[PDB]
């Protein structure tokens, strides 16, 4: 039941913009929102890409710092760990946000400003500083004060990565890179496209897969 994309279709995220995102948002073990902002500030390359980076820095500034930091803290941990534990962690941090003991996540007021009161104008914020790592952990972790538990499924199963997503969507850059490496141990773009668009039985008739592969090749590999 799919259909091809129109002939005027252009992939919104250009190559230079993707490259600058890669440069900025990739972080080490102890990365921060502040570090990201610094990276954005000091990026150098294409003029359009620089303008984009500036724009995204501006919109980060506009948004709340504490929430962004919390999200940053969550995401690395979630990437490391398995689904159920990640869900539990998310639930715990939501609970903490709801019942802020330390008073360091101005959430309910911000929601009122936005959802209840008025759509226009951003919230001014009343808390802007670099939270400590221990504090961040406490924010996104449980305690014996309140009992917490997810509702039991029929299939009470736990896994580190999705069992059925990878087959039935467009193939990640990482998978393409792995394939290229395997091929190496000549290689060319057309051959790669054929492999992805014909050989793989789950991804034979994927819609914009060849274009994606071409974009990936443009971005990463060289002649």
Partner 1 sequence: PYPNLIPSANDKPYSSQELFLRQLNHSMRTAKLGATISKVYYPHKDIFYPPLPENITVESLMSAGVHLGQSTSLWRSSTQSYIYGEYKGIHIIDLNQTLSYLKRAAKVVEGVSESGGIILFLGTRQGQKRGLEEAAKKTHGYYVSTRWIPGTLTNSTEISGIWEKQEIDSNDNPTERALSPNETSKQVKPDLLVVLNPTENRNALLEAIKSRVPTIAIIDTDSEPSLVTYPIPGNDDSLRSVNFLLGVLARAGQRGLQNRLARNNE
Query: Which residues in this chain contact partner 1 in the complex, by CB under 8 A?
Result: 1-4, 198-199, 204-205, 207
- Give the integer Cα–Cα distance in Å for 125 and 107: 10
Dist. CA 151–CA 84, nearest whole Å: 11
How far is C-alpha 59 from the geometric centre of its chain's CA atoms? 16
Q: How far is the CB of 205 from partner 1 (least distance, A)?
A: 5
What is the nearest approach in angstroms of partner 1 to the Cβ of residue 97? 45
Residue 207 CB, nearest approach to partner 1 (Å): 7
Q: What is the dihedral of CA 88, 112, 72, 172, to 10 degrees?
A: 80
* Alpha carbon distance 223, 78 (integer Å): 36
Q: Please, which residue, 6 or 144, has the CB nearer to partner 1?
A: 6
Rg (CA), the chain: 22
**Nearest approach, Cβ of residue 195 and partner 1 (Å):** 10
> In whole angstroms, what is the distance from residue 173 CA to residue 182 CA?
14
Q: Least distance in Å: CB of 211 to partner 1?
A: 12
Q: Is the dihedral of CA 122, 127, 133, 134 positive or negative?
A: negative
Burial class (CB in 10 A: 0-12, 13-18, 19+), 170: middle
Q: Which is nearer to partner 1, 51 or 187 (CB)?
A: 187
- Quickly count: other Cβ atoms within 10 Å of residue 138's Cβ: 15
Task: Supply the minimum distance, in Å, between the C-beta of residue 129 and partner 1.
Answer: 53
Residue 79: helix, strand or coil by DSSP?
A: helix
């Amino acid at each position: 039941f799919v259909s091809p994309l129109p002939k005027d279709y252009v992939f919104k995220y250009s190559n230079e913009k993707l490259n600058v995102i890669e440069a900025c948002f990739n972080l080490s073990k102890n990365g921060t929102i502040e570090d990201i902002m610094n990276n954005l500030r000091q990026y150098e390359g294409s003029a359009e890409g620089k303008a984009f980076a500036q724009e995204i820095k501006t919109k980060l500034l506009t948004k709340s710092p504490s929430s962004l930091q919390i999200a940053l803290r969550l995401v690395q941990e979630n990437s490391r760990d398995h689904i159920e534990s990640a869900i539990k962690r998310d639930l715990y941090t939501a609970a903490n946000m709801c019942m802020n003991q330390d008073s360091l996540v101005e959430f309910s007021e911000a929601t009122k400003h936005k959802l209840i009161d008025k759509q226009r104008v951003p919230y001014p914020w009343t808390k802007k500083e670099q939270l400590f790592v221990s504090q961040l952990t406490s924010i996104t972790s449980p305690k014996p004060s309140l009992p917490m538990s997810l509702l039991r499924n029929t299939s009470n199963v736990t896994w580190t990565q999705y069992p059925y997503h990878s087959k039935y969507q467009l193939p990640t850059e990482q998978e393409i890179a792995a394939y290229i490496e395997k091929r190496t141990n000549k290689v060319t773009e057309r051959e790669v496209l054929n492999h992805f668009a014909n050989v793989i039985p789950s991804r034979r008739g994927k819609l914009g897969i060849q274009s994606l592969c071409k974009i990936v090749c443009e971005r990463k590999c060289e002649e």
